[PDB]
Every structure is written in C-alpha cells, then in structure tokens.
Amino acid sequence: FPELKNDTFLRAAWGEETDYTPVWCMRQAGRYLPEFRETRAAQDFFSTCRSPEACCELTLQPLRRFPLDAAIIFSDILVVPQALGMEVTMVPGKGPSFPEPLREEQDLERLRDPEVVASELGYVFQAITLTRQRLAGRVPLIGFAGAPWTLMTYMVEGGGSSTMAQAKRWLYQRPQASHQLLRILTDALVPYLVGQVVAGAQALQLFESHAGHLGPQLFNKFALPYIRDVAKQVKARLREAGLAPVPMIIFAKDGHFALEELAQAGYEVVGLDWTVAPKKARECVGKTVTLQGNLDPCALYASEEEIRQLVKQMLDDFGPHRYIANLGHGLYPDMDPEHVGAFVDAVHKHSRLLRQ
Amino acid sequence: FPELKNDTFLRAAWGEETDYTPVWCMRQAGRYLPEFRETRAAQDFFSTCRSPEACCELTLQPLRRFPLDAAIIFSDILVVPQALGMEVTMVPGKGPSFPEPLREEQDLERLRDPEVVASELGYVFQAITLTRQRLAGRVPLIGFAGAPWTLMTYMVEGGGSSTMAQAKRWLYQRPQASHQLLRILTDALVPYLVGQVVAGAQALQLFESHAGHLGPQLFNKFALPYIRDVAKQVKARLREAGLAPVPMIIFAKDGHFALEELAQAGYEVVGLDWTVAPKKARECVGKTVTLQGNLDPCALYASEEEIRQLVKQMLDDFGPHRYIANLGHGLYPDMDPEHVGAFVDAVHKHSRLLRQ
C-alpha cells in the first residue's frame, strides 16, 4: 500500500504529540451530502455496501470537500448479523429492519457458525483494499463494526427502539441464551475485524451505540466483558499473523457510567457523546487513553461563527494532548455541508493557534 | 380533607427519619393492570383524563393491589400543551401525536395566554379533589406536570423522538423564540401546579423526561433556569395564598450531568434513572436532598427472587436516610402485576429488616 502521508490521527490515537488536533466526523459519508444521495440512488443500501467501487466512492466524497484527518470505510454495522444468517431491509428510508427478529432461545439455531462470517464478508475486505489503494496514503483508513451488545439489540428488537425492552428482557429472563448470543457475536466479530486490518484498515472503531440503555450492573455483566474480549483477541490474532496491531477505539454512546472501565478495556481511544463534560471525562479516564469527540452534532445547525465558538470551548476543555476531535454522534441527513466544513476548519485553526 | 394516616412518603421527602423506606412506581396506574385497560376501554385517552371519576378510579386501582406509600393522580403531561391551544391525539395505541407541531416562530401566535391555562385545566383539579377525598387519608396524593423543555420537545417534534433534532435545532437556530416558548410554558405551569395543590395534591413531581438529549451547556441555558423558576414561583404563590408548601420532586431522565445543579434548584427530592449508580448520585447531590428511584423497570422481568435480590442491593447502596424507592422509569404495558407486588414487598421487608 502507498506510504501514509498524514498520520496525525494515528499519532493522536497512540498518545503522541502532534502539530494540530486531528478531526473526523461519524457519518462523514452520509445523506447530508448531495453526491452521497446521488451515488446511493444507484442501487439499494445493502447492494451499495457490496460494491467495492461504490463504498470506495462514498468513503472519498467527504475527503473531497473537507481536509479530514481520517477516512472511515462506508459500510454498516448490520452486515455482521446479515452475514450470520439474518434477513435485513432498509425499508423506504425508514431505517434498518429485521422482519424476523430473534425472539427465543431456539432462534439461535438459525445463525451461521461465527467462524464462517468473515468469508461471508469478503466484499467489505475488497472495499477496504480498494479504498486504501485509491486514498494513496492521504490519511489513514478506519475500519469498524458494532459491539456485541449493540448488535444483539438490533437482532432481538428488529431495528431501533427507545427502551430496548425486548433486548433487556432477554438479559433478565434468558441470561444464558443472552451470553450464548453475545459470544457468537464476539466470535464473529474478532475474525471480521482482523480481516479488515489484513485488507488494509489502519485503525478500528467498535460502536457500542446502545450501551446507555443498560445501567452499570447490566453493562458490567453483558456488554463490557465482550467488549474486552474483542480487543484482546483481535490484537492477539494480528500479532500471531505477523501484522502490526492498529489503534482501537471504543465508542459507547450514553456511556457516562462506564467510562472508567472502558479506559481499562484494552482500547487506545475512548470515544464520547456530548452528554459528558470533556473535563469530567478526562478525570474518569486518567491520562493514559486518548479521548475522541464530542460535539453535539445539532450544534452544526448554529451559524458558522457560533460553531467556531463552540469548537473553541470544546478544544479548551479537552486540551491538546491525547485528543481526537469528532462529534458526539453521526451527522444528520439535513445538515449543511458548509457547517461541517466550518467545524473541520475551526478544529484545525484553533488547535494550531493553541500550539503556535 | 381527611387526616393523612401514612405520611412516610412525605417524611422521607422532607428528609426526616422513617420506620421503613416508602415506595411508589411511576405509571403505577398503567396498562400492565388488566383493570386499567378495562376502565380505559370506556372512552378515548383525553376524554378519560377529563372524567374525574375515571381518573380517580385509575389512581386507586394500584393501591388496591399493592401497599404503595403514595398515589399519583392519573393524568398526562400533555394536558398542558393541549390547554395552550394545541390539538393532540393518542392514535390507535401509537402514543402521543400533535398533527400540527410548532415549526417556526410565527406558530407561537396560536398559543393561549399562559395565564388562562389553569382555567382550562379545571377537570384535573376536580379529579384531584375527588381522589384526595376517596383516598380518605390512606397515603399522600402526588400531583405532576412535565418540565418546560420536555413539553417543548413534544410541541415541536409532534410526539416522541430518538434525537430531538427538530427541538434542538430550535435551541441552536432560534434561541430567542425558544426562550419565548419556554417562558410561556413556565408561566402556564406555575399556576397549574399551584391549582393542583389548592385542589388537594400533597406533593408535586416535575417530569423532565427529555433532558438527556441536551448536553450540560444546552441544559444549563434552556432547561435548568425554567426548572428553577417553576419551583421558586410555585412555593411563592402557595405562601402568598396562605397554604403550606408541599415537597417538590425534579425527575431528570438521563440527567447524570445535571445532578449537582438539580440538587440546588429548589426541589426537596431529585428523582434518578437506573443509569446512575446510587452511591455516585449521593456524592453529586450531597446529603441535603432526598433521592428517589432508581430500579431499571426491566428488572421486573426477572424472577421474584431475583427482584428481591436486586432490591436488596439497591437499598444497601442508597442507604436508609433521605431515600424514596421507585423505578428509574415508568412500568411497561407488558409487566407482570405480581412482580410489581414483589418489588413493593421487597422494599418494605428489606428496609425494616435494615432498621430492626
């Protein structure tokens, strides 16, 4: 692969000093971009995901508009439960649906052996090698997947949910089947993430979006240990293959009560939502791990000058070391690309003016 | 009104010692009760709310099953935006909808003067006087309303929302119209809550369900000051009328980052969700205020013996003083009334065995 030219994002992730604060945005390839809607208008969502040229193109689009310090491959966390044998739809701009969710223990029998999952996900590895080639070393490429508990919520709920009532009902009423499913998910994730790195990914982010529904005790029993197992096994498999490990990011949306444990879970970087004050987050995580985040993405509805001021405040509270700027959640379809450009321009100009 | 016989809940709320930990459940009058579905099968939701006998009956039903230490009047937080002039529906078991949500500043013109709102809500005061009579002093009666920001989210979103994107867009793009609306809401709430106390309510709970969507800075600017204004004005109006103030509870769902401020906002009791460890909550709030909560209501899906153990742990972490037991969120329609009975029985037996 081409030699990496701008490794600021990787340096920050590892905890090293940098000349400026690197920045990227969750869903930087997303519907807020007209050209993203245009290229996606070509096929359906999961068929977009299976075309290496199409994922490559969607990954590069934001980089053409903005000097972001990283690319993240275009894909979906739901490719893993699909590759396990579940049928999925993106029903007419309504979001993800599993028409036949897991509802009882016997439903586990329909899933593939998790060791066959990576071979079902070859199309993502193809998209990753292609993108890493076409990026030609401009910035590092991030790979990703959903964390075990978060994927389990989709598989049992059949899509999004404001309560996760069914999924938490499994934890309380079927804790054994729950552990069995979480382990199937971990055992599928580890070889998929290792494959992403073999295909060319330079950093991995694990997305635990539905953590906040758990309190501390459920989260300690049912999410954290799988989260720890993912990073331990991925790093061990990469070493065994003779490959450099890459930095790993754990993003736990609404996960204020888990931050201290997450800082010990084997991840270089802890990604935060906008609900934790950056100074309190630093306190919970100590000064080993790098922090990523955490601007409310709705702030980008404010005027450019207001965005600049919000970025200045956020940067001042995180401080310059062991920090990667990002939003606290994905960009929304209605957001103005010019305001995304302002956020990116503001992080760069303020972090430098903060150094120089 | 009949002399109150069991005032344990009020004593705990004020911060006094008690012989046991009092307990009630959010949505204790709810669809998990077959007789609640039966009496509600009589008319539509908002017409149930307007019948004093029907609200009285729904309020008493759980008290017939369980020795709860308080009743809460049957009503809905959405009665206030309806009384301000907005049209609302409970469309066939789909939840609240406003078919015509507020979308721009000019939409404010359609709202009533907030000073006329209490006269539109006479039916709730009738339901409260009736219930306080029929309760005949068995336990105290709680009145309630939604907090200003939470009501504003319904009025702008038109119902529930996983992002509150439109409502936060108002905060970022129309901060002045936002403050105007929040003030209209506060100015309607204060006389409605005072009326509830004049009608016989012995305690008030303000429900800030949608707080967690805000980070600390938005919450400090747009929710907290209205929250403070509500309690200050209600207490001043009651004093001026010659009436005893009642204890006031602020419940801020997902509000971990606001707990320290909420403990200073003029409320006797801070109600918590299941996401904050009870020991950390105590730390944030000091040992002045009383804490209420915070059992994950999905725990009630567990077996009776497991519920007992979870209650024992929760009680041990809160400790006996300045504590009212409750769930961290309303009971779900599918919950087993026998498991609610276990939770109530467990709080009583463990808190006593903890004293004796």
XYZ file of C-alpha atoms in Angstrom:
712
model
C 0.000 0.000 0.000
C 1.012 3.612 -0.528
C 3.090 5.134 2.266
C 0.832 7.128 4.626
C 1.422 10.867 4.247
C -0.639 12.443 7.108
C -0.578 10.227 10.196
C -1.711 12.872 12.745
C -4.817 10.877 13.538
C -2.731 7.759 14.260
C -0.183 9.690 16.337
C -3.013 11.219 18.495
C -4.592 7.814 18.870
C -1.388 6.303 20.199
C -0.994 9.189 22.580
C 1.825 11.075 20.882
C 2.237 14.829 20.432
C 1.045 16.415 17.205
C 1.193 19.792 15.461
C -2.569 20.130 15.500
C -5.629 18.243 16.675
C -6.780 15.756 14.051
C -10.540 15.651 13.221
C -13.035 13.367 11.582
C -16.889 13.040 11.722
C -19.002 9.990 12.343
C -21.120 9.537 9.183
C -18.959 11.859 7.239
C -20.161 9.840 4.242
C -23.923 10.402 4.732
C -27.108 11.886 3.232
C -26.167 15.497 4.210
C -24.009 15.221 1.045
C -25.992 15.542 -2.209
C -23.412 13.444 -4.063
C -23.848 10.699 -1.413
C -27.644 10.633 -2.213
C -26.801 10.683 -5.906
C -24.402 7.713 -5.798
C -26.697 5.809 -3.378
C -29.644 6.452 -5.742
C -27.886 3.800 -7.970
C -28.833 0.605 -6.018
C -30.391 -0.378 -2.684
C -28.439 0.089 0.597
C -27.021 -3.444 1.124
C -26.223 -3.779 -2.555
C -24.321 -0.424 -2.272
C -22.454 -1.995 0.635
C -21.488 -4.996 -1.625
C -19.982 -2.959 -4.426
C -16.304 -2.145 -3.663
C -16.278 0.804 -6.129
C -19.445 2.245 -4.689
C -18.146 2.030 -0.996
C -14.826 3.457 -2.101
C -16.523 6.350 -3.839
C -18.783 7.156 -0.817
C -15.761 6.958 1.521
C -13.770 9.528 -0.619
C -16.569 12.032 -1.182
C -16.221 13.859 2.161
C -12.412 13.952 1.756
C -13.023 15.900 -1.487
C -14.902 18.541 0.399
C -13.002 18.656 3.642
C -9.424 18.140 4.858
C -10.484 15.474 7.364
C -7.609 13.654 9.095
C -9.123 10.228 8.545
C -11.437 8.259 6.191
C -13.828 5.663 7.564
C -14.903 2.828 5.228
C -18.513 3.011 4.005
C -20.369 0.075 5.389
C -22.997 -0.758 8.005
C -22.813 -2.316 11.499
C -25.676 -4.582 10.379
C -23.579 -6.510 7.865
C -22.492 -8.829 10.686
C -25.951 -10.037 11.747
C -26.801 -10.373 7.980
C -23.656 -12.495 7.482
C -24.802 -14.611 10.473
C -27.898 -15.569 8.513
C -30.475 -12.907 9.407
C -32.501 -11.229 6.689
C -32.353 -7.377 6.769
C -34.006 -4.468 4.933
C -33.621 -0.698 4.625
C -37.410 -0.221 4.033
C -38.138 3.053 2.028
C -35.978 5.475 4.109
C -37.381 4.006 7.413
C -34.063 2.633 8.738
C -32.890 -0.952 9.435
C -35.427 -3.684 9.870
C -35.165 -7.429 10.590
C -38.567 -8.755 9.613
C -37.837 -11.951 11.598
C -36.008 -10.891 14.871
C -34.649 -13.417 17.343
C -37.388 -13.935 19.976
C -36.499 -17.069 21.793
C -33.553 -19.291 22.530
C -34.405 -21.827 19.791
C -33.949 -18.946 17.233
C -30.204 -19.124 17.812
C -30.173 -22.368 15.734
C -30.650 -20.400 12.570
C -27.392 -18.456 12.885
C -24.234 -19.492 10.974
C -21.142 -20.738 12.780
C -19.426 -17.477 13.683
C -16.161 -18.786 12.160
C -17.659 -18.649 8.690
C -18.660 -15.000 8.980
C -15.516 -13.411 7.739
C -15.774 -15.414 4.488
C -19.311 -14.022 4.025
C -17.921 -10.510 4.415
C -15.225 -10.626 1.681
C -16.969 -7.785 -0.120
C -16.162 -5.428 2.767
C -12.462 -6.516 2.762
C -12.442 -5.839 -1.050
C -13.903 -2.390 -0.459
C -11.272 -1.707 2.200
C -8.247 -2.734 -0.044
C -9.616 -0.745 -2.911
C -10.180 2.355 -0.775
C -6.738 2.167 0.907
C -5.177 1.956 -2.643
C -7.246 4.891 -4.048
C -6.634 7.036 -0.943
C -2.953 6.709 -1.955
C -1.803 7.494 1.632
C -3.598 10.873 2.016
C -4.938 9.933 5.524
C -5.406 6.749 7.466
C -8.433 4.471 6.818
C -10.638 3.341 9.755
C -12.454 0.002 9.742
C -15.416 -0.699 12.167
C -18.103 -2.875 13.494
C -20.863 -2.807 16.037
C -20.151 -4.048 19.577
C -21.741 -7.359 20.653
C -24.495 -5.951 22.922
C -25.455 -3.263 20.354
C -25.695 -5.889 17.577
C -27.713 -8.096 19.857
C -30.232 -5.211 20.372
C -30.835 -4.990 16.626
C -31.172 -8.747 16.238
C -33.749 -9.087 19.032
C -35.644 -5.763 18.618
C -35.673 -5.980 14.761
C -34.439 -2.366 14.347
C -34.225 0.732 16.621
C -36.039 1.053 19.962
C -36.380 3.804 22.593
C -36.441 1.344 25.520
C -34.638 -1.820 24.332
C -37.358 -3.584 26.364
C -37.240 -6.834 24.445
C -33.438 -6.967 24.361
C -33.189 -6.247 28.189
C -35.964 -8.707 28.758
C -33.558 -11.358 27.252
C -30.844 -10.263 29.713
C -33.189 -10.581 32.708
C -35.213 -13.618 31.612
C -32.789 -15.548 29.420
C -29.330 -14.660 30.703
C -27.814 -17.926 29.487
C -29.171 -17.606 25.884
C -28.082 -13.971 26.065
C -24.497 -14.978 26.897
C -24.612 -17.608 24.140
C -25.644 -14.929 21.557
C -23.103 -12.381 22.828
C -20.362 -14.987 22.486
C -21.497 -15.922 18.911
C -21.320 -12.235 18.133
C -17.832 -11.783 19.664
C -16.591 -14.932 17.856
C -17.833 -13.476 14.512
C -16.540 -10.002 15.162
C -12.958 -10.946 16.015
C -12.167 -12.580 12.678
C -14.095 -9.877 10.763
C -12.106 -7.074 12.381
C -8.788 -8.932 11.918
C -9.796 -9.301 8.171
C -10.437 -5.637 7.928
C -6.855 -4.976 9.084
C -5.468 -7.681 6.704
C -7.351 -5.860 3.889
C -5.730 -2.548 4.775
C -7.597 -0.814 7.677
C -5.195 1.283 9.786
C -7.436 1.805 12.877
C -10.626 0.066 14.164
C -13.677 1.534 15.903
C -16.087 -0.544 17.818
C -19.548 1.156 18.031
C -21.424 0.464 21.247
C -24.400 2.730 20.392
C -26.990 1.111 22.675
C -24.956 0.865 25.854
C -26.757 3.684 27.666
C -29.947 1.688 27.906
C -28.045 -0.673 30.330
C -27.310 0.516 33.859
C -23.832 -0.157 35.308
C -24.607 -3.654 36.570
C -26.156 -4.979 33.294
C -23.406 -3.272 31.350
C -20.673 -4.915 33.513
C -22.228 -8.306 33.084
C -23.342 -8.300 29.437
C -21.531 -5.672 27.444
C -18.124 -4.965 28.968
C -16.708 -8.452 29.028
C -17.438 -8.905 25.274
C -16.050 -5.505 24.629
C -12.775 -6.546 26.410
C -12.686 -9.942 24.589
C -12.956 -8.225 21.188
C -9.903 -6.040 21.640
C -7.802 -8.812 23.379
C -8.482 -11.391 20.648
C -8.089 -9.004 17.710
C -4.658 -7.789 18.992
C -3.591 -11.440 19.672
C -4.658 -12.606 16.212
C -2.919 -9.760 14.463
C 0.380 -10.422 16.401
C 0.085 -14.157 15.507
C -0.281 -13.279 11.858
C 2.842 -11.170 11.895
C 0.933 -7.884 11.467
C 1.308 -4.548 13.411
C -1.648 -4.027 15.713
C -3.668 -0.933 14.890
C -5.132 1.541 17.369
C -8.661 0.510 18.553
C -11.453 2.995 19.569
C -14.399 2.026 21.820
C -17.374 4.482 21.347
C -20.040 3.952 23.996
C -22.970 6.301 23.302
C -24.645 7.494 26.680
C -21.975 5.567 28.488
C -21.015 8.063 31.228
C -21.230 5.319 33.898
C -18.802 3.015 32.028
C -16.019 5.440 31.169
C -13.650 4.349 33.918
C -13.944 0.669 32.905
C -13.782 1.466 29.196
C -10.430 3.238 29.768
C -9.170 -0.189 31.087
C -10.701 -2.400 28.424
C -7.724 -2.523 26.054
C -8.614 0.285 23.637
C -6.244 3.167 22.778
C -9.082 5.617 22.372
C -12.445 6.129 24.262
C -14.991 7.984 22.086
C -17.550 10.180 23.980
C -21.015 11.625 23.364
C -21.892 15.269 24.011
C -23.515 14.466 27.394
C -20.200 14.158 29.315
C -18.324 17.381 30.025
C -14.822 16.914 28.493
C -13.120 17.788 31.802
C -15.130 15.142 33.740
C -14.393 12.555 31.001
C -10.627 13.164 31.421
C -10.986 12.657 35.130
C -12.752 9.281 34.622
C -10.279 8.041 32.053
C -6.959 9.178 33.545
C -4.227 10.416 31.252
C -3.267 7.206 29.614
C -6.089 6.834 26.933
C -6.853 9.141 24.136
C -10.375 10.738 24.042
C -12.364 11.301 20.906
C -15.470 13.518 20.417
C -17.629 15.111 21.423
C -19.511 17.939 19.794
C -23.318 17.700 19.785
C -23.974 17.271 16.129
C -27.066 19.543 16.364
C -24.615 22.360 17.167
C -23.865 22.344 13.456
C -27.357 23.896 12.985
C -25.923 27.042 14.598
C -24.298 29.804 12.467
C -20.678 29.361 11.340
C -19.393 31.862 13.862
C -21.303 30.110 16.684
C -19.802 26.714 15.566
C -16.362 28.323 15.733
C -17.016 29.458 19.285
C -18.407 26.084 20.367
C -15.293 24.379 18.888
C -13.007 26.784 20.732
C -14.689 25.958 24.010
C -14.603 22.188 23.375
C -10.870 22.285 22.466
C -10.049 24.411 25.551
C -11.751 21.870 27.808
C -10.179 18.774 26.281
C -6.753 20.385 25.995
C -4.272 19.487 23.252
C -2.834 16.100 24.296
C -4.364 12.689 23.730
C -7.381 14.144 21.893
C -9.047 13.468 18.536
C -11.909 15.860 17.661
C -15.173 14.404 16.408
C -18.875 14.862 17.031
C -20.692 13.069 19.727
C -22.847 11.253 17.227
C -23.252 10.832 13.487
C -24.080 13.780 11.191
C -27.854 14.156 10.348
C -29.270 13.968 6.810
C -30.431 17.572 6.931
C -27.111 19.096 7.910
C -25.406 21.832 5.894
C -22.101 20.671 4.279
C -20.778 24.231 4.771
C -21.260 23.980 8.533
C -19.374 20.595 8.572
C -16.533 22.477 6.703
C -16.596 25.154 9.366
C -16.371 22.631 12.169
C -13.361 20.961 10.443
C -11.700 24.403 9.674
C -12.296 25.511 13.289
C -10.655 22.499 14.919
C -7.571 22.925 12.740
C -7.175 26.708 13.100
C -7.849 26.726 16.886
C -5.661 23.777 17.819
C -2.713 25.354 15.910
C -3.291 28.835 17.234
C -3.401 26.907 20.538
C 0.036 25.424 19.865
C 1.679 28.276 17.930
C -59.845 16.673 53.637
C -59.397 13.501 55.657
C -56.425 13.498 58.026
C -53.461 11.716 56.388
C -52.808 8.352 58.037
C -49.494 7.152 56.458
C -47.166 10.087 55.811
C -43.909 8.082 55.434
C -43.514 9.260 51.869
C -43.834 12.910 52.953
C -41.463 12.459 55.904
C -38.786 10.884 53.589
C -39.287 13.663 51.088
C -38.643 16.331 53.693
C -35.575 14.487 54.850
C -36.849 13.066 58.128
C -36.248 9.617 59.613
C -38.814 6.900 58.998
C -39.542 3.349 60.150
C -39.171 1.990 56.645
C -38.384 3.194 53.146
C -41.524 4.390 51.384
C -42.109 3.188 47.771
C -44.164 4.103 44.760
C -43.877 3.356 40.973
C -44.008 5.732 38.059
C -47.026 4.639 35.968
C -48.370 2.563 38.747
C -51.733 3.209 37.079
C -50.866 1.776 33.628
C -51.682 -0.912 31.039
C -49.789 -3.671 32.959
C -53.033 -3.722 35.013
C -55.932 -5.511 33.276
C -58.461 -3.398 35.181
C -56.671 -0.245 33.917
C -57.214 -1.485 30.281
C -60.789 -2.357 31.181
C -61.675 1.068 32.620
C -59.749 2.862 29.823
C -61.644 0.762 27.237
C -64.637 3.043 28.203
C -63.608 6.262 26.335
C -60.594 7.683 24.490
C -57.444 8.750 26.423
C -58.026 12.536 26.751
C -61.693 12.007 27.497
C -60.598 9.554 30.278
C -58.375 12.356 31.551
C -61.446 14.723 31.660
C -63.649 12.476 33.749
C -62.922 12.988 37.488
C -64.454 9.586 38.415
C -62.468 7.789 35.767
C -59.075 9.415 36.870
C -59.942 8.727 40.483
C -60.684 5.100 39.729
C -57.420 4.596 37.732
C -55.429 6.303 40.519
C -56.880 3.895 43.211
C -56.535 0.652 41.264
C -52.842 0.041 42.053
C -53.445 0.912 45.734
C -55.962 -1.976 45.780
C -53.294 -4.380 44.702
C -50.278 -3.015 46.485
C -49.486 -1.185 49.736
C -47.770 1.678 47.900
C -46.808 4.653 50.091
C -48.204 7.203 47.666
C -50.866 7.675 44.933
C -50.130 9.773 41.868
C -53.098 11.392 40.072
C -53.988 9.855 36.694
C -53.372 12.417 34.043
C -50.937 13.193 31.230
C -48.041 15.677 30.883
C -49.571 16.622 27.513
C -52.654 18.253 29.020
C -50.676 21.495 29.332
C -49.780 21.931 25.651
C -53.428 20.914 24.820
C -54.703 23.598 27.230
C -52.362 26.074 25.460
C -54.312 25.514 22.262
C -52.543 22.609 20.542
C -54.544 19.719 19.143
C -53.391 16.258 20.393
C -54.225 12.601 19.688
C -53.481 9.170 21.149
C -53.674 7.496 17.671
C -54.625 3.717 17.960
C -52.086 2.709 20.682
C -49.248 4.609 18.844
C -48.577 7.182 21.598
C -48.995 10.995 21.673
C -49.186 12.906 18.448
C -49.569 16.614 17.605
C -50.663 16.588 13.986
C -49.709 20.291 13.722
C -46.393 20.778 15.709
C -44.824 24.186 16.230
C -42.276 24.646 13.403
C -41.475 28.288 13.312
C -41.583 31.364 15.476
C -44.866 32.657 13.989
C -46.531 29.411 15.310
C -46.265 30.796 18.832
C -49.170 33.176 17.971
C -51.615 30.328 18.149
C -50.972 29.558 21.821
C -53.294 30.845 24.587
C -52.112 33.377 27.150
C -50.437 31.137 29.712
C -52.472 32.816 32.494
C -55.660 31.269 31.173
C -54.291 27.730 31.260
C -55.231 26.805 34.754
C -58.891 27.629 33.999
C -58.718 25.225 31.024
C -57.443 22.514 33.358
C -60.264 22.593 35.964
C -61.078 18.982 35.151
C -57.700 17.884 36.541
C -58.247 19.921 39.769
C -61.707 18.209 40.065
C -60.076 14.811 39.647
C -57.505 15.693 42.306
C -60.134 16.839 44.954
C -62.232 13.807 44.278
C -59.278 11.427 44.586
C -57.939 13.053 47.791
C -61.496 12.663 49.300
C -61.883 8.989 48.194
C -58.345 8.093 49.332
C -59.640 9.138 52.784
C -56.057 9.776 54.034
C -54.623 6.290 53.281
C -51.445 7.783 51.653
C -50.453 11.124 50.246
C -51.523 12.169 46.705
C -48.890 13.428 44.207
C -49.728 15.968 41.506
C -47.416 16.474 38.417
C -46.588 18.090 35.189
C -43.959 17.984 32.512
C -40.965 20.339 32.761
C -40.767 23.232 30.262
C -38.023 21.820 27.982
C -39.663 18.350 27.892
C -43.046 19.886 26.965
C -41.358 21.993 24.349
C -39.892 18.792 22.757
C -43.378 17.340 22.323
C -44.786 20.573 20.927
C -42.044 20.963 18.303
C -41.383 17.267 17.455
C -45.136 16.346 17.447
C -44.592 13.268 19.678
C -41.556 11.147 20.727
C -38.151 11.305 19.011
C -34.836 9.448 19.421
C -32.722 12.526 18.592
C -34.865 15.587 19.431
C -33.245 17.021 16.276
C -36.005 19.476 15.494
C -36.364 20.645 19.097
C -32.513 21.158 19.461
C -32.485 22.793 16.084
C -34.826 25.462 17.656
C -32.334 25.934 20.517
C -29.407 26.427 18.116
C -31.184 28.320 15.328
C -33.980 30.138 17.139
C -32.721 30.670 20.679
C -34.902 33.736 21.216
C -38.175 32.023 20.086
C -37.046 29.055 22.171
C -36.760 31.227 25.295
C -40.134 32.807 24.486
C -41.787 29.320 24.326
C -40.014 28.071 27.465
C -41.249 31.129 29.346
C -44.863 30.635 28.067
C -44.580 27.087 29.314
C -43.209 28.097 32.752
C -45.906 30.808 33.071
C -48.618 28.162 32.373
C -47.099 25.534 34.597
C -46.775 27.653 37.736
C -50.480 28.411 38.094
C -51.430 24.841 37.068
C -49.218 23.303 39.745
C -50.395 25.804 42.396
C -54.022 24.779 41.405
C -53.181 21.175 41.851
C -52.116 21.913 45.447
C -55.245 24.093 46.046
C -57.307 21.086 44.829
C -55.628 18.766 47.315
C -52.243 17.489 45.965
C -49.785 16.854 48.824
C -46.537 16.635 46.763
C -45.592 17.699 43.180
C -43.320 15.996 40.645
C -41.919 17.770 37.699
C -41.017 15.301 34.870
C -38.014 16.332 32.806
C -38.005 13.173 30.628
C -36.112 14.583 27.633
C -33.266 16.297 29.441
C -30.623 13.731 28.491
C -30.754 14.728 24.857
C -29.218 18.123 25.947
C -25.552 18.258 26.917
C -24.574 20.272 30.022
C -24.302 23.618 28.246
C -27.714 23.450 26.451
C -29.268 22.103 29.617
C -27.834 24.999 31.715
C -29.102 27.542 29.258
C -32.521 26.172 28.271
C -33.803 23.702 30.804
C -32.362 24.455 34.237
C -33.376 28.062 34.587
C -37.052 27.189 33.837
C -36.799 24.283 36.160
C -35.595 26.671 38.958
C -38.300 29.281 38.103
C -41.056 26.654 38.411
C -40.202 25.644 41.954
C -39.451 29.274 43.131
C -42.749 30.656 41.795
C -44.914 27.736 42.922
C -43.562 27.959 46.528
C -44.007 31.798 46.485
C -47.581 31.568 45.201
C -48.564 28.949 47.722
C -47.105 31.043 50.649
C -48.994 34.121 49.309
C -52.216 32.163 49.290
C -51.785 31.123 52.887
C -51.148 27.455 52.015
C -48.370 25.067 53.293
C -45.832 24.421 50.564
C -45.620 20.782 49.539
C -42.457 18.820 48.797
C -41.390 19.110 45.096
C -39.540 16.342 43.117
C -37.471 17.047 39.969
C -37.043 13.825 37.838
C -34.487 14.321 35.077
C -34.304 11.146 32.963
C -30.628 10.555 31.631
C -29.609 13.592 33.594
C -26.343 12.367 35.174
C -24.547 15.587 34.121
C -27.140 17.841 35.821
C -27.455 16.158 39.203
C -25.281 18.617 41.097
C -27.269 21.610 39.778
C -30.606 19.857 40.241
C -29.772 19.345 43.949
C -29.555 23.216 44.140
C -32.630 24.041 42.094
C -35.123 24.311 44.959
C -36.589 20.794 44.968
C -36.750 18.576 48.085
C -36.268 15.417 46.082
C -34.101 14.546 42.969
C -35.500 11.504 41.113
C -32.906 9.319 39.255
C -32.869 6.842 36.367
C -31.167 3.446 36.564
C -28.051 4.699 34.706
C -26.509 6.468 37.750
C -25.040 4.251 40.460
C -26.860 5.224 43.710
C -23.554 5.856 45.521
C -22.317 8.270 42.793
C -25.715 10.056 42.812
C -25.380 10.682 46.584
C -21.950 12.113 46.015
C -23.275 14.558 43.363
C -26.241 15.650 45.428
C -24.703 15.975 48.903
C -26.722 14.951 51.924
C -29.256 17.688 51.953
C -31.748 16.461 49.201
C -33.728 13.328 49.194
C -33.144 10.847 46.284
C -35.862 8.869 44.608
C -35.508 5.823 42.284
C -33.959 4.047 40.654
C -34.602 0.459 39.702
C -34.437 -0.398 35.989
C -38.016 -1.243 35.315
C -36.955 -4.125 33.004
C -35.548 -5.782 36.145
C -39.153 -6.625 36.938
C -38.945 -9.165 34.051
C -36.605 -11.175 36.296
C -37.970 -13.860 38.693
C -39.404 -12.759 42.055
C -36.366 -13.960 43.952
C -34.037 -12.081 41.558
C -36.159 -8.872 42.041
C -35.765 -9.327 45.795
C -32.003 -9.527 45.420
C -31.829 -6.520 43.093
C -33.923 -4.508 45.615
C -31.625 -5.534 48.457
C -28.613 -4.307 46.538
C -30.289 -1.016 45.548
C -31.368 -0.315 49.169
C -27.868 -1.140 50.503
C -26.315 1.356 48.093
C -28.749 4.192 48.739
C -28.786 3.601 52.488
C -31.822 4.332 54.663
C -31.868 8.138 55.042
C -33.274 10.665 52.607
C -34.432 7.954 50.178
C -37.731 7.137 48.459
C -37.713 3.889 46.426
C -39.116 3.942 42.909
C -38.155 2.658 39.484
C -35.964 4.564 37.170
C -38.733 4.898 34.637
C -42.406 4.093 34.208
C -43.721 0.500 34.313
C -44.183 -1.150 30.826
C -47.533 -2.397 29.492
C -46.328 -5.987 29.416
C -45.173 -6.164 33.012
C -46.439 -8.768 35.476
C -48.523 -7.240 38.340
C -47.132 -9.984 40.621
C -43.570 -8.807 40.008
C -44.607 -5.166 40.837
C -46.046 -6.626 44.139
C -42.738 -8.327 44.793
C -40.780 -5.147 44.222
C -43.094 -3.267 46.659
C -42.965 -6.171 49.258
C -39.154 -6.312 48.929
C -38.547 -2.623 49.598
C -40.709 -2.771 52.720
C -39.323 -6.019 54.181
C -35.651 -5.135 53.460
C -35.727 -1.551 54.685
C -37.297 -2.713 58.003
C -35.012 -5.681 58.424
C -32.386 -2.995 57.693
C -33.666 -0.864 60.571
C -34.819 -3.568 63.006
